[PDB]
Ligand SMILES: OC[C@H]1O[C@@H](O)[C@H](O)[C@@H](O)[C@@H]1O
Ligand SMILES: OC[C@H]1O[C@@H](O)[C@H](O)[C@@H](O)[C@@H]1O
Ligand SMILES: OC[C@H]1O[C@@H](O)[C@H](O)[C@@H](O)[C@@H]1O
Ligand SMILES: OC[C@H]1O[C@@H](O)[C@H](O)[C@@H](O)[C@@H]1O
Ligand SMILES: OC[C@H]1O[C@@H](O)[C@H](O)[C@@H](O)[C@@H]1O
Ligand SMILES: *[C@H]1O[C@H](CO)[C@H](O)[C@H](O)[C@H]1O
Ligand SMILES: *[C@H]1O[C@H](CO)[C@H](O)[C@H](O)[C@H]1O
Ligand SMILES: *[C@H]1O[C@H](CO)[C@H](O)[C@H](O)[C@H]1O
Ligand SMILES: *[C@H]1O[C@H](CO)[C@H](O)[C@H](O)[C@H]1O
Ligand SMILES: *[C@H]1O[C@H](CO)[C@H](O)[C@H](O)[C@H]1O
Ligand SMILES: *[C@H]1O[C@H](CO)[C@H](O)[C@H](O)[C@H]1O
Ligand SMILES: [Cl-]
Ligand SMILES: [Cl-]
Ligand SMILES: [Cl-]
Ligand SMILES: [Cl-]
Ligand SMILES: [Cl-]
Ligand SMILES: [Cl-]
Ligand SMILES: [Cl-]
Ligand SMILES: [Cl-]
Ligand SMILES: [Cl-]
Ligand SMILES: [Cl-]
Ligand SMILES: [Cl-]
Ligand SMILES: [Cl-]
Ligand SMILES: [Cl-]
Ligand SMILES: [Cl-]
Ligand SMILES: [Cl-]
Ligand SMILES: [Cl-]
Ligand SMILES: [Cl-]
Ligand SMILES: [Cl-]
Ligand SMILES: [Cl-]
């Protein structure tokens with residue numbers, strides 16, 4: 001186990017393919033920049049802006065299943 | 066006693082969507098900071114500030130179902 | 131994923147059986163108390179005193195295996 | 196790969212066993228808090244304060260082979 | 261470990277042979293240009309245009325397997 | 326050209342010790358931020374601000390021997 | 391080794407025009423005085439003090455071309 | 456070859472004909488007075504003040520071909 | 521014209537073939553090491569030990585021709 005925290009300082013511009021996304025998570029509140037991280041099936045991890053529509057829709061899609 | 070207990074040391078500013086939350090709990094009073102943790106349908110866990118209005122509203126909504 | 135942190139507030143009195151320990155970790159520096167956590171074969175987390183000899187020996191055993 | 200960055204927001208107080216440490220690294224400059232992360236043989240990861248003598252000594256020990 | 265980031269400034273013209281791709285990832289959101297990087301079996305990183313059909317199909321192939 | 330190139334988007338404030346640096350290089354002029362990367366004996370890589378006095382002193386020392 | 395190497399034993403105070411410089415190099419570390427030599431388009435060669443701010447500004451500019 | 460250095464201790468006031476100049480050079484930093492030497496086709500050599508505009512313009516003209 | 525000075529830090533071991541030598545000169549008194557430089561027909565500069573008999577004979581040959 002690790003004491004480090006994953007933070008984001010920038011976001012991807014174009015929406016990654018929804019079908020590739022395995023899960024998501026909100027970055028810690030200690031992070032200076034609020035962000036969402038999408039995790040793909042092969043464990044690519046992409047920082048996303050929670051203020052974006054497609055990001056919110058993706059999260060909504062993941063939770064409601 | 067000797068079991069770990071979850072503590073929060075910060076809160077994200079942006080409120081997570083009410084419809085995603087399935088339950089909540091208070092962190093132990095032994096923690097340095099008072100906190101509420103919202104658990105989502107997919108078991109994402111977010112620390113929240115109990116002194117915030119929207120947090121209170123969420124808890125009320127969760128309790129009054 | 132969760133942004134809560136496993137913190138300890140008490141140390142186990144009786145040394146755990148070594149053959150039950152599958153792994154260990156140090157609690158975050160965010161926690162007010164320094165602590166070692168052992169994870170058992172049954173995935174239970176047990177806080178232990180970092181200064182105790184058996185604790186240091188278990189850790190050294192786990193790392194040097 | 197991932198575009199999240201490991202950040203530290205607190206430091207361990209007690210020096211961890213030098214012999215357990217496999218490597219170290221400096222956290223990114225994006226991180227609000229400057230830190231050093233020690234990585235053990237079994238990949239425990241511990242945040243450390245680079246302004247501490249034992250931390251600097253450990254780093255010196257690691258890089259000088 | 262390094263705090264530099266792999267960024268792209270040009271996209272390969274000829275589609276890479278699929279059988280040589282062993283991994284992909286998206287460049288950080290910090291990079292000025294959006295890009296897809298394919299990692300070859302010879303461990304070389306190749307920038308590709310995210311909009312190109314063969315690029316999206318390669319990614320989709322890599323994630324769904 | 327289709328190869329990725331290292332870019333820096335921040336610098337740690339605390340100068341790493343001169344003695345563990347074995348080499349340096351400038352990031353591509355295509356990067357949004359001008360930067361120097363110091364490579365340690367154990368191949369840690371740290372982004373540095375070329376406009377800083379200590380960075381230039383280090384480079385001079387590395388190149389004058 | 392038996393070949394001569396250029397050394398500098400002083401520096402002109404007034405910085406030469408940046409636009410005139412096409413390249414630069416460090417004198418050998420064997421030279422008693424550390425120095426940078428700027429080479430103009432018409433191949434004039436001027437000794438410069440590497441500890442000067444404008445000199446490192448020039449070098450940085452020449453590198454992030 | 457010679458280890459004497461050409462130095463200037465005064466400057467011409469009247470600008471010499473640009474078309475007569477085939478080259479220029481900065482006097483060494485060893486010289487007490489910073490200066491520019493213009494060399495004519497028939498190898499007349501004139502000391503000039505680099506702080507004067509016409510001198511700078513002449514140099515700029517020579518370097519930029 | 522250049523502000524740098526040709527200095528030597530090593531003496532050639534095998535005496536140059538006399539017929540290859542075009543001219544000679546003494547390195548500046550500014551150089552930390554005394555030396556003789558022979559200029560070859562191919563316009564290369566070779567540092568030589570000023571104490572060696574063959575060096576002094578070559579110089580004597582060149583001056584008394
Ligand atoms: O990864 C989430 C949590 O991990 C802990 O190790 C860190 O100390 C916390 O600050 C963080 O919120
Ligand atoms: O790739 C690793 C990370 O290094 C950090 O320094 C950067 O802020 C990130 O943008 C980058 O993704
Ligand atoms: O002008 C080209 C210059 O390149 C440098 O690397 C050499 O040390 C100089 O001797 C040479 O004059
Ligand atoms: O590593 C950067 C290199 O850039 C070249 O242009 C310089 O002449 C070298 O002195 C330098 O080492
Ligand atoms: O230092 C001795 C002198 O020798 C001459 O050849 C150089 O042009 C001067 O710059 C130098 O100062
Ligand atoms: C790492 O340690 C345990 C798992 O061993 C737990 O998930 C903690 O939350 C994490 O920091
Ligand atoms: C969420 O949990 C930890 C951090 O909380 C880590 O990044 C995991 O990869 C992710 O699933
Ligand atoms: C992860 O992706 C590649 C490796 O595949 C690279 O090392 C980057 O540094 C990281 O983002
Ligand atoms: C250093 O590289 C990345 C971050 O730069 C990651 O945390 C690795 O685990 C570490 O060794
Ligand atoms: C004179 O000697 C050689 C030419 O033979 C060289 O140019 C030196 O720089 C100069 O002092
Ligand atoms: C510049 O080179 C030497 C001195 O550096 C000499 O004066 C020449 O005449 C000039 O062209
Ligand atoms: Cl965005
Ligand atoms: Cl899914
Ligand atoms: Cl609900
Ligand atoms: Cl409020
Ligand atoms: Cl606590
Ligand atoms: Cl004991
Ligand atoms: Cl500390
Ligand atoms: Cl080691
Ligand atoms: Cl941060
Ligand atoms: Cl150190
Ligand atoms: Cl960039
Ligand atoms: Cl393209
Ligand atoms: Cl296409
Ligand atoms: Cl070194
Ligand atoms: Cl230029
Ligand atoms: Cl620059
Ligand atoms: Cl004048
Ligand atoms: Cl001309
Ligand atoms: Cl010298």
Ligand SMILES: [Cl-]
Nearest residue numbers: 572573574575
């Ligand atoms: Cl001899």
